[PDB]
Design a protein around this ligand. Sequence first.
Ligand SMILES: *[C@@H]1O[C@H](CO)[C@@H](O)[C@H](O)[C@H]1NC(C)=O
Lengths: 161, 53, 55
Amino acid sequence: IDKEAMGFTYSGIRTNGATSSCRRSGSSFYAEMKWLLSNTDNAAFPQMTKSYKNTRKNPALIVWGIHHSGSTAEQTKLYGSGNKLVTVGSSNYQQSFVPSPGARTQVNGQSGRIDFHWLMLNPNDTVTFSFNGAFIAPDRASFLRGKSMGIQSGVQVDADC
Amino acid sequence: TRKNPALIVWGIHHSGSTAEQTKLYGSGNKLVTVGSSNYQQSFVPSPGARTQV
Amino acid sequence: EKTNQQFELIDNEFTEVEKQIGNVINWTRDSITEVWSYNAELLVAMENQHTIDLA
Ligand SMILES: *[C@@H]1O[C@H](CO)[C@@H](O)[C@H](O)[C@H]1NC(C)=O
């Protein structure tokens, strides 16, 4: 995988969303995703639209996340009140997503979930992320390198045979 | 009424903006419900900007 | 003389695939296994008749 930065800028919203499940010298998050929040708790969230153009000569593995919070007092704490939406479009793709809060079972100490989705942006195509909350934004798009093969095993690797 | 299956096709419009969906179908939350004796689904439009095709 | 056709992984031993696609893969792999178990047992039994008869 060859990671290539997207260069998104964020105007007036928080970005350092962290959690206690991802322990990396304290409380952190994913290394290639951002958790876009409001400026403080229970504050509003402006409607945004960010775009990326695949300039290279190969398909680009784009990945974004949707946050399904644990409560309805948790979704409003981090993206304000109201009904939220994430719209994702391309020249070969169109879908849209809506967060769905609610309690569920504790995994790693939390009851919220993050749904990761993906598409392969064709060369000289454009992806667009309309959102107003519950969006785990991408940071670096990914590109494939060549040909290999993947196995699943339980024994040790030997470099002699 | 005929003695053969019928290929029914409908479309759902996902407009480019929220000022575009309200221009052509009014304000509010919209819905399309489609039912049959062997089928049941429902659809909701989702406006928002995307790339120009 | 070994084949040059590379077969890759379509199942998953850790996180199981969807059940309707997990049964089409399982039905197809048992069908092909019946073919290569028949052809191996036929070829060995046929070349034992040829080895005995040539000597
Ligand atoms: C397919 O067969 C394997 C045995 O190799 C089994 O572990 C797996 O559960 C089967 N899949 C389904 C969907 O039955």
